[PDB]
Amino acid sequence: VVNPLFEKRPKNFGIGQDIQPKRDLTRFVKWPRYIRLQRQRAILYKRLKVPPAINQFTQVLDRQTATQLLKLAHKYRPETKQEKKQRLLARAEKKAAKRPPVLRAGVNTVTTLVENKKAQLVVIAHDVDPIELVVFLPALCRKMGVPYCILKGKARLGRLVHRKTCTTVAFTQVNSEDKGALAKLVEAIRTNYNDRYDEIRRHWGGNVLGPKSVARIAKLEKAKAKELATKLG
Amino acid sequence: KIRTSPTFRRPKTLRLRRQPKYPRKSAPRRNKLDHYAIIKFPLTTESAMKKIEDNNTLVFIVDVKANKHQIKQAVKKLYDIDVAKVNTLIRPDGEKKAYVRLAPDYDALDVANKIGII
Amino acid sequence: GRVIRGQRKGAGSVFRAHVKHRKGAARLRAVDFAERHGYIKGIVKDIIHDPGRGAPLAKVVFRDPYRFKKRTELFIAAEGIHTGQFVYCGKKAQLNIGNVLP
Amino acid sequence: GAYKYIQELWRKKQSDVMRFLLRVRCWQYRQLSALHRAPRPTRPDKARRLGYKAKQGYVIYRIRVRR
RNA sequence: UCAGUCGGUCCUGAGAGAUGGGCGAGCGCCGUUCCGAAGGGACGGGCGAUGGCCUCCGUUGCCCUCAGCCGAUCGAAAGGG
RNA sequence: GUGAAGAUUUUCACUGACCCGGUGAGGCGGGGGGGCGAGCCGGGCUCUCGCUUCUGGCGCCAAGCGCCCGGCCGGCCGGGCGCGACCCGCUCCGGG
Ligand SMILES: [Mg+2]
Ligand SMILES: [Mg+2]
Ligand SMILES: [Mg+2]
Ligand SMILES: [Mg+2]
């Protein structure tokens, strides 16, 4: 019932025997200089001995706690321009015929309300292009006793406010029904960051070799160790 | 999707056309090279008259910026006479002398004596 | 004083090499997977005299393993080679006159 | 105010924290061309005290000079 | 002093010369493939619009797919043409 | 710049700054899988290979399999995906 003319002719992709197929070459592409630069910069970050003051941002909050924090933060979002206009219109007509607590954005605003311990929680983005903007903030919060946590993504941190990016968001006051959840989050954040600051400042980063260098060293030490211990006894 | 070629080239992007909020010039420039200024004056030399009386052609003095097609169309519109061919040269004085060979039906002698040159 | 001829030879004004009639630089094929693991065979199509060069050149044509084309290259001719000879280039190429191996 | 901490930190260039940033920035800028535009200033506080304001119309060009 | 057919106009030789880049206080200089995201193209297929006996095709607009080149450009009225 | 040894210094190391070479930056480092020899009790470890050498021919734009989807009347026409062509990685490979 099968046509006998349907044979199979397999290609033999040997050396010098057949044309090499168009396979995946995603590793050997001569990438543009900007792509090359933004990749080897991350390589250099993993290579060089990153100081603890900078590497502290690499250690970040876990996923479940992060999304729980976002759920809490979604309650106190600031007013947009249109609804702020609506509020002003409502007050104007009400007068013709109390503000709730909200988030505290901006690094300058946050550090001013932290240095006088007027805030209960601080959330810091881990991906500021200059780290010098927020490098001192974890130490400042530790000395002032204000709980602080590090969150991955300034974009998702900046989506709490209705702008593009925001370095830091501060919780200064919460409503009664969210007081318990805020306190539960605060104690866990304090244990993660504030209570382990000595280890944080003692924890350097980077100083990791590449996979080829690790492999060659590992096989070298494996060969010498297996030729030493096994034969000796 | 995967990359086959080991080289990377700029992806082709979408580019739009000009939609200015105002025309750069208020009005298009008037055609200064019209059918009246393309031809200046026919020659009245004895050689020209000997040529019109033998080869059934005409001689004109025109500007240097006129093509043979433009001369043919201008003569056709100004005098309602079919043109067989045009031969143009630039005189040492600077003006362009154009020989306009007419179609066999028309007669150069009649055209010349009805446009003035005789 | 006037700058000497030895100094004037570095400016490359009239002392540049005459490289018009030269057929090209005699370079071995670039190192690739074929030579690094196996071998690639080519045919000696012709042998050419390179003007201004004391050694003859041999134009060897290989088959490109990555696309359908026939690459042509010029090697320094080793005496004993001839047109129509198969020249093998790579790690696995055996030891004989003409072949090039690491 | 954040800018006070920033300028105090920048005055401590010889420390390891700033030295790592300086060498990383210096290498990255060396990889780029001699004349190019940075979308945002590298030093906000220093730009502000030099007169820069974060408003449309002010741009920053990072240029390299052979020492 | 009249040209499709005679030449220039086209091509490129030795060379010259921008862009990338680098240098330079600076006018600018070096450099010609080198520290480059260097393709404005296309057999074919799909989506959508127009015209003509809306048959079939053409112009398109968008997407898929394919694509090497060697460097923009100038350089001979005795070289090729 | 990062380490290990000897007494701030010397030697031996690493690359990551910096330098050179190749390319159309075309198969790099490991792991897995498939054979070829050695030595133990059908099985385990180390190591090796990875398909082309009698000749001036040809070789690209996939056959084959498996799984989905469309239109038309079990049959007809026309598509998509994966293995075929192993997986994961942080520098394109090399030499300083
Ligand atoms: Mg004729
Ligand atoms: Mg120049
Ligand atoms: Mg020309
Ligand atoms: Mg000629």
Curated annotation (Swiss-Prot), chain A:
Q: Where are residues bearing N6-acetyllysine located in the sequence? A: K8, K71, K184
Give the subcellular location.
Cytoplasm
- This protein's record includes keyword Kinase: no
The GO terms describing molecular function are: RNA binding
How is this protein annotated for GO cellular component?
cytoplasm; ribonucleoprotein complex; ribosome
Cross-linked residues for Glycyl lysine isopeptide (Lys-Gly) (interchain with G-Cter in SUMO2) are K22, K71, K212
The answer to whether the entry has keyword Cytoplasm is yes
Q: Which UniProt keywords apply?
A: Acetylation, Cytoplasm, Isopeptide bond, Ribonucleoprotein, Ribosomal protein, Ubl conjugation
Annotated family: Belongs to the eukaryotic ribosomal protein eL8 family.
- Subunit text: Component of the large ribosomal subunit. Interacts with CRY1. Interacts with DICER1, AGO2, TARBP2, MOV10 and EIF6; they form a large RNA-induced silencing complex (RISC).
Summarize the protein's role. Answer: Component of the large ribosomal subunit. The ribosome is a large ribonucleoprotein complex responsible for the synthesis of proteins in the cell.
Q: What is this protein called?
A: Large ribosomal subunit protein eL8
Q: Which organism is it from?
A: Oryctolagus cuniculus
Curated annotation (Swiss-Prot), chain B:
Record GO biological process: translation
Which parts of the sequence are annotated with region: Beta-like import receptor binding (BIB) domain? 1-36
Modified positions (Phosphoserine) are S5
- Briefly state the modifications made to the protein after translation: N-terminus is methylated by METTL11A/NTM1. Citrullinated by PADI4.
Keywords assigned: Acetylation, Citrullination, Cytoplasm, Isopeptide bond, Methylation, Nucleus, Phosphoprotein, Ribonucleoprotein, Ribosomal protein, RNA-binding, rRNA-binding, Ubl conjugation
Residue(s) carrying Citrulline: R3
Instruction: Kindly list the positions at which N6-acetyllysine occurs in this protein.
Output: K32
Predominant location: cytoplasm
Subunit relationships: Component of the large ribosomal subunit. Interacts with LYAR and GNL2. Interacts with MDM2; this interaction may promote MDM2-mediated p53/TP53 polyubiquitination. Directly interacts (via BIB domain) with IPO5, IPO7, KPNB1 and TNPO1; these interactions are involved in RPL23A nuclear import for the assembly of ribosomal subunits. Interacts with IPO8.
The domain section of the record reads:
The N-terminal beta-like import receptor binding (BIB) domain mediates interaction with IPO5, IPO7, KPNB1 and TNPO1.
Its function? Component of the large ribosomal subunit. The ribosome is a large ribonucleoprotein complex responsible for the synthesis of proteins in the cell. Binds a specific region on the 26S rRNA. May promote p53/TP53 degradation possibly through the stimulation of MDM2-mediated TP53 polyubiquitination.
Assigned protein family: Belongs to the universal ribosomal protein uL23 family.
Protein known as: Large ribosomal subunit protein uL23
Q: Write down the species.
A: Oryctolagus cuniculus
User: According to the record, which residues of the full protein are present here?
Assistant: 39 to 156 of 156
Curated annotation (Swiss-Prot), chain C:
PTM remark: The modification is impaired by hypoxia.
Q: Of which family is this protein a member?
A: Belongs to the universal ribosomal protein uL2 family.
What biological function has been recorded for the protein in this entry? Component of the large ribosomal subunit. The ribosome is a large ribonucleoprotein complex responsible for the synthesis of proteins in the cell.
Q: Which residues cross the membrane?
A: none
Q: Report the locations given in the UniProt record.
A: Cytoplasm
Q: Where is this cross-link: Glycyl lysine isopeptide (Lys-Gly) (interchain with G-Cter in SUMO2)?
A: K41
**This protein's name:** Large ribosomal subunit protein uL2
Q: How does it assemble?
A: Component of the large ribosomal subunit. Interacts with CRY1.
UniProtKB/Swiss-Prot annotation, chain D:
Record lipid sites (N-myristoyl glycine): G1
Q: Which residues carry this modification: Phosphoserine?
A: S33
Instruction: Enumerate the subcellular locations listed in this protein's record, separating them with semicolons.
Output: Cytoplasm
State the protein's purpose: Component of the large ribosomal subunit. The ribosome is a large ribonucleoprotein complex responsible for the synthesis of proteins in the cell.
Quaternary structure and interacting proteins, as annotated: Component of the large ribosomal subunit. Interacts with IFIT1 (via TPR repeats 1-4).
Protein family (similarity comment) = Belongs to the eukaryotic ribosomal protein eL15 family.
Q: What is this protein called?
A: Large ribosomal subunit protein eL15
Q: Which organism is it from?
A: Oryctolagus cuniculus (Rabbit)
Portion of the parent chain present: 2 to 68 of 204
